[PDB]
Write an enzyme that holds these catalytic residues in place. Structure first.
Site, short mmCIF file in Angstrom:
data_model
loop_
_atom_site.label_atom_id
_atom_site.label_comp_id
_atom_site.label_asym_id
_atom_site.label_seq_id
_atom_site.Cartn_x
_atom_site.Cartn_y
_atom_site.Cartn_z
N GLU A 54 14.47 43.69 115.01
CA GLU A 54 14.61 44.30 116.33
C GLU A 54 15.09 45.75 116.27
O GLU A 54 15.91 46.11 115.43
CB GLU A 54 15.56 43.48 117.20
N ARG A 65 23.23 49.79 124.36
CA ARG A 65 21.85 49.65 123.90
C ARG A 65 20.88 49.35 125.04
O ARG A 65 19.67 49.42 124.86
CB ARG A 65 21.73 48.54 122.85
N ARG A 69 13.88 46.86 124.00
CA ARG A 69 13.77 46.74 122.56
C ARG A 69 12.33 46.58 122.11
O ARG A 69 11.45 46.25 122.89
CB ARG A 69 14.52 45.50 122.07
N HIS A 85 15.84 42.52 128.26
CA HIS A 85 16.78 41.91 127.33
C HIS A 85 16.32 40.60 126.69
O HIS A 85 16.99 39.57 126.80
CB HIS A 85 18.12 41.72 128.04
#
Length: 96
Positions: A54, A65, A69, A85
């Site tokens: 990731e 963060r 992702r 998320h």
């Protein structure tokens, strides 16, 4: 389950930045970047431990963060984008 595919150009510009860092094998901005993604919920196809990794997709202004992702799969050109998320994922198409 994977939520279809999506063109790289349709994702936030930061997604393109993350992929470029992955292509150069870093360095990355966050320490969590590059760690193994366990796919613990089996949202992505079943693979052995280490198949997925990731990386953070920076959210402008975020102190953390954030929720974006890119999960890489060891197969050629296999990358997944999540903007919620890890809830949902879409296969990234770098050709468009």
């Amino acid at each position: 389950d994977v939520s279809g595919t999506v063109c790289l150009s349709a994702l936030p510009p930061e997604a393109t930045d993350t992929l470029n860092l992955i292509a150069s094998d870093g360095p990355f901005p966050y320490s969590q970047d590059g760690v193994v993604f366990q796919n613990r919920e089996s949202t992505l196809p079943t693979q052995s431990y280490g198949y997925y990794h990731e990386y953070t997709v920076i959210t402008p202004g975020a102190r953390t963060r954030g929720t974006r992702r890119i999960i890489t799969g060891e197969a050629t050109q296999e990358d997944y984008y999540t903007g919620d998320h890890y809830a949902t994922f879409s296969l990234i198409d770098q050709t468009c």
